[PDB]
Design a protein around this ligand. Structure first.
Ligand SMILES: [Hg+2]
Ligand SMILES: [Hg+2]
Ligand SMILES: [Hg+2]
Lengths: 414, 408, 413
């Protein structure tokens, strides 16, 4: 059948696809690929941008409700502060690395015969006022990004306040609504898994055309991306986690020795949740309180922002850079912080890195319909699989780093 | 608030007489200005629920039929309906080509004939089944994407009900429970709208008769006929053969269903009839533990009745527009319609509701005067057709529960 | 850094303080600078409100419809509903009456862009009646078609009640779940308003600051003229209907008020049918209303009481239309006003329902809230809504008791 290690399939689809593309590039048929292979790629891209709205919205409602004070616990408030200070660093490293290696420059895409031309921007007044949806159903209906973010947050928070009410009529109503929204977000995730079953074919078709038509330069450019990620990735573990543990009297060396297979599971399954049974067992091996890890671990699975913050730092810069538009530090963080803010509750979430990207593009007015934007996004989407293994692996490590720092601040260790 | 079907038939029979005399020496135009708006109110009220029912109905439907959520006695009854609908489709088209309903009524209302557009590149029509934004598809009536999303969602929910996580599992249970109920309410609303249907159906044919001459009655009777003969040809040609193939006697089988069919034929309700259906299944000696499960499904998932309705209706509608339609597209459009109606067996006037959904999905704006005036015709006789629809649905539900019961 | 100080106080402070600032900056000041710098805060406030107008009206009506819906409706229910229908009827007539009595809007002929607003007119009745029916309800709901939304929200709520009358427990829990989540969306939308009223002091400051600075000093008289027309019709309701209705039911009106005294005073000051509900029930027991009666009728008047809104709209509608330059007749008025009221059912409060309905009414008529004039006209009412909304609630609560007592003594079982 096709149930064989889904990730194996996708990496086979990428490696094999680039070879097919690239040799049909050299003496081949850039155009034939474009007429015949590519539409299979397009289907894949559509199946992704599809759920981009339901997941962002329904995910944020649930996510907001999670962190919403003071439905949030006191042991919880400390773990929230944790992810906030780490996301802060994860963002800096993101940008830093994306500037350090310069992914995108060197590939000047001008696909229809013309380069893409960002039309910016309205007056700040006009753009701040417009985050407030004129009509919340409509925002959601026709893909209005920022408004949906803002309404989804303000609603998730509202729900929690309703679950602090004496009126039981009221309390269950909220509990019902949130539960229903939850199941939606939940179903959306299961749908993604199904799409990832098609991903090996679709991703084959995507890079096949990119390779066939962009030339061979691309492979260097993509390795440039992945590199900037995995080096910021490990730079995170070493520079922040290890420091934060050191600074909490915890031993970083022996810490790793327990996390070892929990990171390796995460690296391999791409799944904060798939990995969560392993994570929890390791948390116990380190001797974290039962009452603690059984609460804080199922959070970092969803609200851990550090992984995605790194992805976007590099994805953002590549995507904008390949388009040809030179992007500054101020725009960078502006963009990235906003993606991260809105990512909360989508930690995994199969391929959230790429999903946030769409939602961020849609937000900066770069129509996915444009051929350049399209062929640009298609590149990152290709290697997303690779990137998403590091993304999860850092997520999990940081979840343990945090749940162990917070564990010790409760006096429940060994 | 007196027997509802009586009223719709009273209104139709009565309405054509009124329209037809007022047509002849009368004032086709007057009717058009004063009588007709009541008719248009009716068509709107229907096209209204076309979206919610299709979406909500399919989410629920797909979650029924979904693997691994489906049961063993269930898998067989589904396999039953799949292979009966197969044949029901064939008869539909076949009868629709046999009698030629529509041609000979050449409607060109505005002083101009309707002119269907075809067709974007296969590539572009296939990529487009995938909604770019699901809320959007839903919001501004995109048919194929809504089907595609509603199926892919229903299946997803079932996987969530096979989860270790009780939080996850309850949430799915809830979402589904609320979509169901939306579905459910949608139907309740139809029952009420059918309360206006006698006035509405009066107004509709009144105009059609007053304006399209007397040729119409022949053309409509042509439809009715093509359904009722496909209808009984289904009972005899498939059910009887399936009963015989499973040692059940066709003749004495009917002797038991006799009132259950008569009830179905007169209530238009697979569900309204359900108590009578189950009573007969007991009289025939089916296991309690089998008919109490399989009969409530046939009432929702039985595609055979609709499959004949769409076959014929589709061919009439298109044919009357002027557009001659081939066997290939006939089937393609039909499979699509039936394969989206799952979980709406009855569901009062489902037959017509689907038609609207298939029309909106295949070019053909319901706002267009030709398209409108043609759909107004079938909408008129829907009541007649919808009685045979249900009656055959119910017969095939017993045939299925009996065949499956025997294998147990 | 914490302004969790009495929320109403803040809005009143913001109004009085805002008008002075604007008015002095108006005279020799910088109408323009206010427009460029203070106003954007006033606009952000109008956006947060106009935001919820769709979800509150829809999800609110669904629940509302369900609550009045037969035959889920009790016999103790049927009477209280009939009560409210006959009181809203009069509540409307007084609204229009007072709106015509004082003439708010005239004398302020607003032509803001350098051009006066022009209401379009009306398609044939056929076309407007057919169009109350949503061709696609998700679409109605998604892009703000008001009339089709109303009609779908009612026809939905009612259907949901019938599903609760089914022997199929599948069917029955399904309906119960759906309603449970629609309510609760409703409920959350209300919580989101409470947060918006938190910024309302700042926003209401900015709003009148500009209208004062730019519209002159004639505005303050015109607004006092509104509030007057409401508060007098408001007490004309108590004296002219409730008191005549209590008397006509052998009940003593003066000694009735002696119990309601604080129950009305709470409502006047909290702006909250729900916040006041504890105080209200305590008073219905003091008046010696049955426990199994007020435990049902008081939580209804809290949501379905239409009389308070009926007055507000009578005046708001006339002022808004009058200021724009369109003179509006008594037919037009009720047609506009019945409609709003009839669709307000289940939104009694709901922090600021009065203004909320008005948008929804403005959108429905054909006055695009983006229009410079319409905006500057709505902005004025939005400003004093807070004042009007205290009276609104207070009248509502008096009439909930007047009702629960009239129905109560017709019982004694
Ligand atoms: Hg996308
Ligand atoms: Hg329709
Ligand atoms: Hg508004």
């Amino acid at each position: 059948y096709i149930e064989y290690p889904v990730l194996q399939k996708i990496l086979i689809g990428l490696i094999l696809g680039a070879i097919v593309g690239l040799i049909l590039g050299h003496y081949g048929y850039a155009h034939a690929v474009h007429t015949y292979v590519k539409p299979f790629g397009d289907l894949f891209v559509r199946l992704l941008c599809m759920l981009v709205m339901p997941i962002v919205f329904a995910s944020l409602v649930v996510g907001a409700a999670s962190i919403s004070p003071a439905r949030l616990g006191r042991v919880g408030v400390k773990i929230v502060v944790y992810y906030l200070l780490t996301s802060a660093f994860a963002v800096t490293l993101g940008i830093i690395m994306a500037r350090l290696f310069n992914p995108g420059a060197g590939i000047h895409l001008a696909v229809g015969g013309q380069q893409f031309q960002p039309h910016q921007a309205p007056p700040l007044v006009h753009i701040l006022l417009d985050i407030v949806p004129t009509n919340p159903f409509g925002a959601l209906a026709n893909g209005q990004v920022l408004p949906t973010i803002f309404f989804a947050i303000i609603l998730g928070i509202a729900i929690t306040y309703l679950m602090n009410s004496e009126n039981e009529k009221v309390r269950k109503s909220a509990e019902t609504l949130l539960d229903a929204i939850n199941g939606l977000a939940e179903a959306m995730y299961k749908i993604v898994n199904g799409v990832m079953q098609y991903a090996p074919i679709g991703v084959f078709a995507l890079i096949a055309y990119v390779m066939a038509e962009q030339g061979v330069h691309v492979v260097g450019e993509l390795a440039k991306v992945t590199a900037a990620v995995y080096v910021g990735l490990t730079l995170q573990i070493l520079l922040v986690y290890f420091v934060l543990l050191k600074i909490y009297g915890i031993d970083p060396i022996s810490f790793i020795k327990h996390a070892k297979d929990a990171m390796l599971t995460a690296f391999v399954t791409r799944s904060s949740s798939g990995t969560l049974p392993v994570t929890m067992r390791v948390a116990k091996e380190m001797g974290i309180s039962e009452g603690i890890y059984s609460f804080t671990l199922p959070l970092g699975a969803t609200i851990n922002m550090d992984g995605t913050a790194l992805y976007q730092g590099v994805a953002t810069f590549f995507i904008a850079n390949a388009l040809g538009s030179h992007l500054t530090v101020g725009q960078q963080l502006t963009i990235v912080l906003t993606a991260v803010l809105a990512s909360i509750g989508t930690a995994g979430v199969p391929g959230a890195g790429a999903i946030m990207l769409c939602m961020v593009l849609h937000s900066v007015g770069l129509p996915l319909t444009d051929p350049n934007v399209a062929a640009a996004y298609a590149m990152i989407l290709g290697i997303d699989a690779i990137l998403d293994m590091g993304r999860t692996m850092v997520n999990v490590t940081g979840d343990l780093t945090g749940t162990a720092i917070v564990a010790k601040t409760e006096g429940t260790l060994v």
